[PDB]
């Protein structure tokens, strides 16, 4: 009667990538069909299954005979990493009615997940004709919504004689009752396709698909969410692992309406307000992306097995991309700072004599639920100077702004809910475009 023991006791299928192969590890290893164009994209720890809108990428599961009848009178749930591209305004007005069933038991009845417009919806097809739906009206705040290309989780906590619920990140976000049904002779085929979609560039990426032969409870599903969230790798914004030597823009976590901006050649950084878009006509609004400064993350000194995957807590440099010329961040000695403990940041300070602390290290310390990333800055003698944080203060003659800092003072707030030195790493990704 413990969390993880019941967790691994109730799972009755586990679709998981293992060395370019998809297979079930739930003991009841059932058929895992695959087709030449069932591509797989970068995954948190490994790879990530993909889908494309045509008859190519079917991944169906002919399940075991004994468990074929699993859904006759039993409650259950689905769970998986999910993300869909940002449906643009144009494609939105184009396809704001299409209702394609990603996961289903069609032919030809039973539980059937469906994605339509900006909605996820359970659809259950029982014997006597009755049907219940549990819509989730879109989270209108796209920039943190649940169909915004954010790697996110979903669970559908079906219960026959009780309610079924949906859970995003574990949190509740919508529900509706189910009772008043009958026995279902549900078929066994488990389609994973963009069935009857109407957009060519539509694609849903399911990861770590699993089913549990019983109901659940909020506490253990939160623990489960955490469990899947391995600390092992150090995710970027979208959820896929960070990439060394690839472009990145960076966004504070309590400054969504902000983003980064260089001031001058080789001198200090600073922050600024939010360029974005707002379709107040289709309840759509989101901070625009890819706009700010481009950043390159290297290893400090090359290695033999140079895989761009970043492990937790690895020593790195930090180069900024500018006119496709590279420039490194840092802090030169005697670098004028705030309170002498909040070290101002710099970029490749072309000092004739003065050296420059160029030795940083990606470090994960907080936010085991949300995909943030803290950056640390050491000296050249292995001493913690602080994290790159948000702390006000004017300098010289120019006006006061928000500047990037380094202050071990931050280390005394790591238990808080909101910090000032947590960060987002957005890479230039397909499934989101500033309309």
């Amino acid at each position, epitope marked *: 009667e413990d969390i993880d023991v019941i967790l691994k006791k109730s799972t009755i299928l586990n679709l998981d990538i293992n060395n370019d192969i998809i297979s079930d590890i739930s003991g009841f290893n059932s058929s895992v069909i695959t087709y030449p164009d069932a591509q797989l994209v970068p995954g948190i720890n490994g790879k990530a299954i993909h889908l494309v809108n045509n008859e190519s990428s079917e991944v169906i599961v002919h399940k075991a005979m004994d468990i074929e009848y699993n859904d006759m009178f039993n409650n259950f749930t689905v769970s998986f990493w999910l993300r869909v591209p940002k449906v643009s305004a144009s494609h939105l007005e184009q396809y704001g009615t299409n209702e394609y069933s990603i996961i289903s038991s069609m032919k030809g009845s039973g539980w059937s997940v469906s994605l339509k417009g900006n909605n996820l919806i359970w659809t259950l097809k029982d014997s006597a004709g009755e049907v219940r739906q549990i819509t989730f009206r879109d989270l209108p705040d796209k920039f943190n919504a649940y169909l915004a290309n954010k790697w996110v989780f979903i669970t559908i906590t079906n219960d026959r004689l009780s309610s079924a619920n949906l859970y995003i990140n574990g949190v509740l976000m919508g529900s509706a009752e189910i009772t008043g049904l009958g026995a279902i002779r549900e078929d066994n085929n488990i389609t994973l396709k963009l069935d009857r979609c109407n957009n060519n560039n539509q694609y849903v990426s399911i990861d770590k698909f699993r089913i549990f032969c019983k109901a659940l409870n909020p506490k253990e599903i939160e623990k489960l969410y955490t469990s899947y969230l391995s600390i092992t790798f150090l995710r970027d914004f979208w959820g896929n692992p960070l990439r060394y030597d690839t472009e990145y823009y960076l966004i504070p976590v309590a400054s969504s309406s902000k983003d980064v901006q260089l001031k001058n050649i080789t001198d200090y950084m600073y922050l600024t307000n939010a360029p974005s878009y707002t379709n107040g006509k289709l309840n759509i609004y989101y901070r625009r992306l890819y706009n700010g400064l481009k950043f390159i993350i290297k290893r400090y000194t090359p290695n033999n097995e140079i895989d761009s995957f970043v492990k937790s807590g690895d020593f790195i440099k930090l180069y900024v991309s500018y006119n496709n010329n590279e420039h490194i961040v840092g802090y030169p000695k005697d670098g004028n700072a705030f309170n002498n403990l909040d070290r101002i940041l710099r970029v490749g300070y072309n000092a004739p004599g003065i050296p420059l602390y160029k030795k940083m290290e990606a470090v994960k310390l907080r936010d085991l639920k949300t995909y943030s990333v803290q950056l640390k800055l050491y000296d050249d003698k292995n001493a913690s100077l602080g994290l790159v944080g948000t702390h006000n203060g*004017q300098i010289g003659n120019d006006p006061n702004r928000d500047i990037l800092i380094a202050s071990n003072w931050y280390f005394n707030h790591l238990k808080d809910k909101i910090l000032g030195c947590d960060w987002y790493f957005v890479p230039t990704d397909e499934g989101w475009t500033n309309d």
Partner: antibody
Amino acid sequence: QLQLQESGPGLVRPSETLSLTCSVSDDSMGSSTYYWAWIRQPPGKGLEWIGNVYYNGVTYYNSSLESRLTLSIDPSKNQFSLILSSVTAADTAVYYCARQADNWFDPWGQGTLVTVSS
Amino acid sequence: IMMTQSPATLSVSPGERATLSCRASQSVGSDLAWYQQKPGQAPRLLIYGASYRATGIPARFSGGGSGTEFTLTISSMQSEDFAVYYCQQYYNWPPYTFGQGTKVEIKR
């Protein structure tokens, strides 16, 4: 010390072209990372601006005033210019391109008036 | 919404205190700027974040407020330093969509 100093003098006839060059001077580096935007000024009236485009050149402020004017950059002399065509007399004005240094149009220049006469 | 001047008036004499106002929505609850415009030349800024002046600007000006709705005051005015002002917003492609007007007045 950034003395904005613009040119493109004269008057324009309707539906013709206007060249408007925003020569930012004495700032050798100049275009480092901050924006640049334009200002519309119909004499004795409210003030909506025109646009704002970066030297990466993503886009400019597109309310219902684009598709007749266009914004340009030139990191050569830190310069950047304004394209104008298919204009009516309703925009006879004195325009202002100004340094949006760190997202506030702090230093402004002499500028010059444009007369869409006939 | 966007900006609306509530009110849009002014009645002052040499020496007294100016009183202006604005109104808007607050989804970007950003402290903002105020622009003066001497007639003889191009306009310029007076404040930003309603409190922080820029260089060369004597501190006799100020302002404050909450959300994005803001007001400001100016004490000890000299006729030589008087003209219509303007208040901002934060559109998410930001330059700042201007306030309609701040009608001014010299008292005789």
